[model samples]
Target chain A: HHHHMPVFHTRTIESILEPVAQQISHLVIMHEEGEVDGKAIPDLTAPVAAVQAAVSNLVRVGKETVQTTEDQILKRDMPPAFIKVENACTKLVQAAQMLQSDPYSVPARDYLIDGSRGILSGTSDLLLTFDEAEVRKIIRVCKGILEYLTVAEVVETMEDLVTYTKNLGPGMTKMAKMIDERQQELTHQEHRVMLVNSMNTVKELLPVLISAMKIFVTTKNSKNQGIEEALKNRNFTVEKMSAEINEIIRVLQLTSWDEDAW
Target chain B: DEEFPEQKAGEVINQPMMMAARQLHDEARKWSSKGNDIIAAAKRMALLMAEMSRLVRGGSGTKRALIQCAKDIAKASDEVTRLAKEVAKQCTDKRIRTNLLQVCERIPTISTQLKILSTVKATMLDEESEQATEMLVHNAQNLMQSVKETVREAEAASIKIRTDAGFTLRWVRKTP
Candidate 1:
């Protein structure tokens, strides 16, 4: 009999993780249009609908992962969510830290707004632990970096998309176009799917992480209460938090599920 | 039993001893300065009370334990008084000696209060233990309140007196 009752573990996990994905998705769109450092204060314009489409895809994939894990936990005795969730979060943070560490890996770094792209390399020695609160903060930053990467990819395609639509000479009009509609749609659609998969993997593993943390806390001695209480409180927050993030993703209508494929 | 001849209405129930508060304050100060680097001082004090209670109870109804407990209480009282007097003598301030005199005066009264409480609560007293116990508890509470307050005063002053030389602090904000 388990005495440890985490009231909102699933929601709390979702709350902590989804915000990072959302932030990253937003950054991706912003970065795509060549806006870094946000120095263009009260910046007038933004990337077109195609960029938003990519961001929406990223968030949708994370939501799918949450649904998949919840289903898996009921039908199958999964080991725990913490392993995968932590791994995803860790990788996200580390990836951001690495990108921040090395400019060569990140695409946006090439589109510098300030001195030498961004983030001082080697000065930061610590490989931050995901168990800490600071990990969430770092992950949010990474999300921005990644979203920008996505945006950059989209914008690169825009030049080609425009060049074919109108002729090089002055006589050309909107009717005189040479766009490969099929290839253009396929390119955007494929990128969206890949982004969704990356984001979904983290979301799917959240419930397991939350459930396992609750189990660990309740089974441990109550007398050593500080860490145990922290875990217990956090579990409640995560449980409901995950659901709310899922709602947001659902409303955004980022992905289409196919039962036949599964 | 120490609880005979209760004070009439508006009568002053004087402190029997003075140094207990001083000793308590000193101990508390030492512990506070340690700054969470040691076991809880409050918990330690509770344990001390428990031990004292046990010692008194062990000799109930018998003269041996009763006499031993009495002697221990007296010894504690004298030690506190001596410490208090020593502090008074070392004081640079003339007013501090006057305060110390009042403090020392209260020590014997505290001693009597503790003795009465022990006799009443120990359950091994000769005859008039019940009424005596009630009086002891009342007097004990009063003395405990005073001791706690005095200790608090001493502690606050101690902090002010020992301002660190390494850290400079000044009022940075002015009232509007």
Candidate 2:
């Protein structure tokens, strides 16, 4: 998704985490110099309180962001993300407090920078993990579909066909729904069109594939020429859809394309 | 350095590189013979593969250093292969040579894998990049195993040849 839009919830952790990282860095700078933005911070009560308020918001919002999301991995991971953020916040805040007490403490000043970097780096890692985990959901489904497709080669009996439907139908329905949801979530027109084409391609050919299986199971040695051809077409359909799915997964994970090697 | 290892962090977790580096270093140190140009090459490959892992794992090496390390490994592997051809060439046993030659046949594939990993190292850990890396690592380990098997076979065959040569040399001495 390349286009800019109203992204309210899709990016909560980084949005909440980064500004405080910047503020703590600047707060120490303000404490270092007597003035910033043409104002004096010789007395650091208001400025220090400003930091406390911002960090408090981050703590509350960060926790709530994870609480509201349904992704189990996200839920599992986010506590530690918040833990690092708060831990770094306390380190810098206490260092700032010490700096307020004595304006010439180098260790306090140094640790303010170090603590801020920790918060910033932790934020970067959390956001990266979040995005990758989200893409992981998509990849798992694509891999599952491919596995189920491969098992289609064993569909020789009518009972086998019935069992195949029992095994694969639910996943295919889920895949279709997931694909539609992803198409909506994506921002690129090119990606959306790619999904649309691949989606309908799978949609149209799935019936043909099942019918071919049905016919092959009933007729005398129909699998040789007829059903094998349908199976081939299904294979083609699955392979192309996966290629498209991989493109979407790459996009979702923000994997930049290489100019060095094709 | 930051993300958990379970999540694709910027840490080097390529098993094949580590395995090959260890095995090759041991080979270079242990194998001493008339034609040890191949052993020397194996030692050189060990250093570069280890370096590649270090740089790719967010070490202090410059990008140029990493790229050069990649290039060196490829070149060193070529040197190893050439010397390996000669090692296989003079072998009295055809079976061991055949197995070793098969190992050589797949060197190109593993080299291509190295290229892919080196190329994709700059990128983040996505499915495509992860796949490329794993393909390289898996093949590297496999290639190392095949090489070990070939070496074992060669050692066994050469011992038998040595026994025959000892008997013949004694027979010639008795005649003189």
Candidate 3:
């Protein structure tokens, strides 16, 4: 059932952090040599543009990291995972506020660093779920099924779906294993319990997703009501997961910043 | 300037349009003593339309009043467009010609649209009539902008023409 890929390609924390640090350095240089120092009547324009760009980039990266984690949790149907990502995003927004403030301060800078690292850890942990080949295969097949439903011959192209029927078993097992792995690493008691409950849901839902696809394939008409219902259910799951992913990403980027920094 | 208030309140009234015309007349008088007639005619056309619009705004929404306002606006716009074209033709500079021509084409359409909108009666559904009135107000604002642009471009052309004539007279005097 959890067929949506986390698409967590950028796993290394340093890859995300380095650019943020580099921009922060540029901001520091502007403050030291530019208008703030008061000796030279600095160019003024370029320095502000640099600060704005750096703040924007950091905010963007922070959001992306949270979104990626939220996607992973939503894919697994773990509600606690959603909450955790939301919490992380809340922290990120605080940091972003500080980063965007009038003049940079040590406390705001520290808050931003902490928020960035928290999101990084959350993202890295989520990336670990996409480590399996079976998970990737399931994602590909699910995407193919969605594409098939969208095209003109969706009803008549039942035979084309045969290629995916075989991978469902291995994918399900791997998904179960992924759930168990997360459970062991989570450490939080409530999060662990939530994972266990979502694990059972995945088991129940995966077969239903496959069975609905099979029904749609066998139905002769392209506009068969059964197939449409099946496709709608599948798409709804994916859509719900995607919405949560986007929300967490936004929260992560916007909520954690220091207000006084402004 | 003191004569302006009395002039505005008389049977012939339109303070802003009259002021604009007076400025144009003074400038054209300096640019070419013979150009005052053209400036005065343009001023008269503008003032007449300004008076019509003011009447339409102040009077109750009657079909005759609305149609009269629309016709006056449209006719005024046509006269302005013709004057703009003439100024553009006299001006040697490409930028001023283009700017003047831009105003010439846009002003008339706004006037025509305002006329069509005015035909809708207050007896129509409240929502739709409100929407129509809102659109009329918006178009009136747009028409004012077109008028301002026309004035700006016309003034610019007058300056350019005067400068060219000045240079030519100096060169002819210098001919040895």
Candidate 4:
């Protein structure tokens, strides 16, 4: 069912805390069974404590950004196609956590490779599904989206963000190099990590797209390629590109929100 | 020097004798300050003779070269003779006519020289023989030099007529 458009809410850490908690819970269950129990059999313990510590550290790092405006965090769902975006994002977060510490874990190290592909596909799907009219509408709604999502830094981070999205294709190519360097087989877990990382990368991609759209609105003509010009109304200013993505996510945050809503 | 490079030598070798031939051919044609229809007519005749001379020179090797040399010789001879006649008819100085007549005398001998070269069976492109292509070119060049000197003298005598004294006598002194 098509969900109505969402309204903006000032993002609070608590909004993310639940999702963060659920993720921690899933990791805990996996770690408890999968890890070395240092206390019960200190000598028999494997590097399980480290794995747990890594995950804990990861959550801590991510939670630190819970106050980040939803605009900054929300991006097009990854894995390109509607069918796979969610799985790709979930896998990215999981793989990112795995990298927080380790003797390279099975799936985690491979997350970069998996995530590379997922992020690409997710963006591709979002773009492909939009007809010219719908894209025109999306642009209109997203005009001011980036205002809420500005990243503070010494330099304008717009170029950095642009570079990040632009680098995705080559990033995947680098992942292929990484895989080759380690001489590790491109295992299934690795593939999943790649898919998930790619998905999450796509989620984080709003800054790039919104910024690009913002720039397009000002200095550029309708000939610009990425976001449709129809979406380029007053509401589709740079500030709104990031802002509306979060709003869309919040509306689509409903567990049952379908592709039709998007 | 302003002449077409392709036809310069041919024109020179054929001009004098051709003019002489026409002087005989059209005895009514006269030399005068107002016009030199005879010289012009001879020039046309020389051009035709040069064209015919080119045909006589066409073939392979040394034979072709001799023919080309002959063409050049005929041309230079023609120019020397025609200009010498123009000087004789125009100039009052006895010394200038004597010099002009002496140059004109070379025309028939130059024609004889060309006629001998025509019999030598040489191609224009040839470099081998008693008279190589280079030697023939050298000789053509010498003939051209002499003809050029003779024509320059003719031009001087003609320009002398352009002065105020000469201008007053232009119609009166000129032979019709």
The candidate that wins on DockQ is 2
True contacts kept of each: 0.00, 0.00, 0.00, 0.00
**Candidate 3: regions farther than 4 A off:** A1-262, B1-61, B121-125, B162-176
Question: Chain B alone: TM-score in each candidate?
Answer: 0.47, 0.65, 0.62, 0.47
Error of 1 at B55 (Å): 6.5
Q: Is candidate 1 or candidate 4 better by lDDT?
A: 4
Candidate of highest TM-score:
2
For model 4, the stretches where C-alpha displacement exceeds 4 angstroms are A1-262, B1-76, B79-83, B121-130, B159-176
Most accurate candidate by lDDT: 2
Per-residue lDDT tens digits for candidate 3, residues B30-120, read 3331333333434444444454434433433233444455556667667767777777777788888887876675665555555544433
Q: Candidate 2 chain B: minimum summed lDDT over ten consecutive residues — where?
A: B167-176
Ranking by lDDT: 2, 3, 4, 1
Off by over 4 Å in 1: A1-262, B1-48, B52-63, B94-96, B116-127, B142-176
lDDT of 4 by residue, A17-134 (tens): 2233223323332332333331111111223333233334433433343343233212232112444544544555666556455524556634523442343333323333322223
Candidate 3 chain A least-lDDT 10 residues: A1-10
Q: Candidate 4 at A94: error in angstroms?
A: 99
lDDT of 2 by residue, A171-191 (tens): 777877877876665433345
